[PDB]
Amino acid sequence: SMEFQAALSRKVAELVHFLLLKYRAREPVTKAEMLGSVVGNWQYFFPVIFSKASSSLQLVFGIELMEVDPIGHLYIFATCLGLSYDGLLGDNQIMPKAGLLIIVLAIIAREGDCAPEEKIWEELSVLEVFEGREDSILGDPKKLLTQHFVQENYLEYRQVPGSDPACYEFLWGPRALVETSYVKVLHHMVKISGGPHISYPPLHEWVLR
Amino acid sequence: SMEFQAALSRKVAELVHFLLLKYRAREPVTKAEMLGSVVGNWQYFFPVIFSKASSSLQLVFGIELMEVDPIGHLYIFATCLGLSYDGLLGDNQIMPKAGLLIIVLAIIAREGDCAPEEKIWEELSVLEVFEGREDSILGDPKKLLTQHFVQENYLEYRQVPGSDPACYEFLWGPRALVETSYVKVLHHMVKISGGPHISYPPLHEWVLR
């Protein structure tokens, strides 16, 4: 079962990267093509493989998979929230970055008008994408990543006013305010997490014996 | 530990009902009064007892606990979303109903303009508040409860147009549309669930070996 779940997980990863190649090539893709990429008895599990792969694209890569033909089941791709950026570079196999960008925007959005950089590092250091390589000579990968977002004008970075010694904070840049909004981003994070997950308290926490 | 968690849970229930009595009496309450109601070594755990009790009031009872004096730590109460209804009856010790009302409104809101009654029963039958007494002679308690919400004009109940044999659906009534909105309700459910809970997929689900 644990061995089965892992094997199932592997089939998800394969569909994700099948779809990523289509995304890069800007090729529309049918459900029949996706099902065709899944081999053998695993086709029986295509519904969960598809929905898991589809969720991965949104959450991890910031990529939306949209059906434009409900009869022939033809899908196209779009960047989440309609952003004009995915952080790619030619055909180099580097990771699409819009999902990570949206996560940073969201962290800031929950904190108000701006967030101390320490909160950003704290929240980002949890993501397994950085695979514990913060001791890189070139510099902490997660910090160099946020520099992309600043230089693309999705983020601004400044000294906290009146701070001594200097502290620094992130805020939304002009490009983020144009292409989306606070509400849209926080709504998006809810949507792609599978709605709100309400842990209802047990009876003995609100009923007296 | 399991025995400790349960004992801790019991202290939460006691604070909840301490606060409920204040709520019924429309008495403001200080943090010092709350801490005073907690006995002995359990005072060391007041922060988690408070936050758990505070969340219970919102989620279960539809009651907001609001600090109006940040210096003396004086709190008052309000109905969640500002609704003019809590479903109480004099000093009879029956459960405040606004939390259950908001949950029903939310179920409908997620489904669009209306929801089949079967979806309502399905979602409601999960709540432990009904303690498996759906076989009551008087009628299924959860169904009789929604009748309160209809008669108070928070909900409307009608036959699904063109259904044969007749099927039925719930929708927001005039009173719900006046006092709140779809957006506000779904936002509220997120807020009181402790933000969106994002289960990020494991590396082997989106990285190839």
Residue numbers in the entry:
A (entry chain A), B (entry chain A): 102 to 310
Structure paper excerpt:
All MAGE family members contain a shared core MAGE homology domain (MHD) which is a ~ 200 amino acid long domain, which is well conserved across the entire MAGE family (individual human MHD’s share more than 40% sequence identity). The MHD domain structure consists of two highly modified winged helix WH domains WH1 and WH2 in a tandem arrangement linked by an extended β-hairpin. The biochemical basis for this activity appears to be exerted through binding to and modulating the activities of RING domain containing E3 ubiquitin ligases. Rather, each MAGE protein appears to recognize a unique region on its RING partner, suggesting that MAGE proteins are able to function as a versatile and adaptable protein interaction module.
Crystals of the MAGE-A3 MHD domain were obtained using a construct spanning residues 104–314, and diffracted to 2.0 Å resolution at Diamond light source beamline I24. The structure was solved by molecular replacement using the experimentally phased structure of MAGE-A4 as a search model. The electron density map is of overall excellent quality with the entirety of the single molecule in the asymmetric unit being modelled with the exception of the final 4 residues at the C-terminus, which were not included in the final model due to disorder. The final 15 residues at the C-terminus form an extended peptide, with a short section of 310 helix, which in the MAGE-A3 crystals forms an extensive interaction with a neighbouring molecule related by 2-fold crystallographic symmetry. In MAGE-A3 the interface area is ~1650 Å2 per monomer, consists of a mixture of polar and non-polar residues, and includes 5 unique hydrogen bonds, 1 salt bridge and two prominent aromatic residues, Tyr 301 and Trp 307, that protrude deep in the groove and make extensive van der Waals interactions with hydrophobic residues. In contrast to MAGEA4, PISA analysis of MAGE-A3 identified two potential biologically relevant dimer interfaces. In addition to the peptide interface detailed above (“dimer A”) a second interface is formed almost entirely by interactions from the second WH domain. Comparing this data to the calculated data obtained using the monomeric MAGE-A3, dimer A and dimer B models reveals a significantly better fit for dimer B than either dimer A or monomer, when comparing either in reciprocal or real space (chi2 of 1.99 versus 4.94 or 2.6 respectively). Taken together it is clear that MAGE-A3 is predominantly a dimer in solution and that dimer corresponds to dimer B, although it is possible that at higher concentrations these dimeric units may further associate via the C-terminal peptide to form larger open ended oligomers.
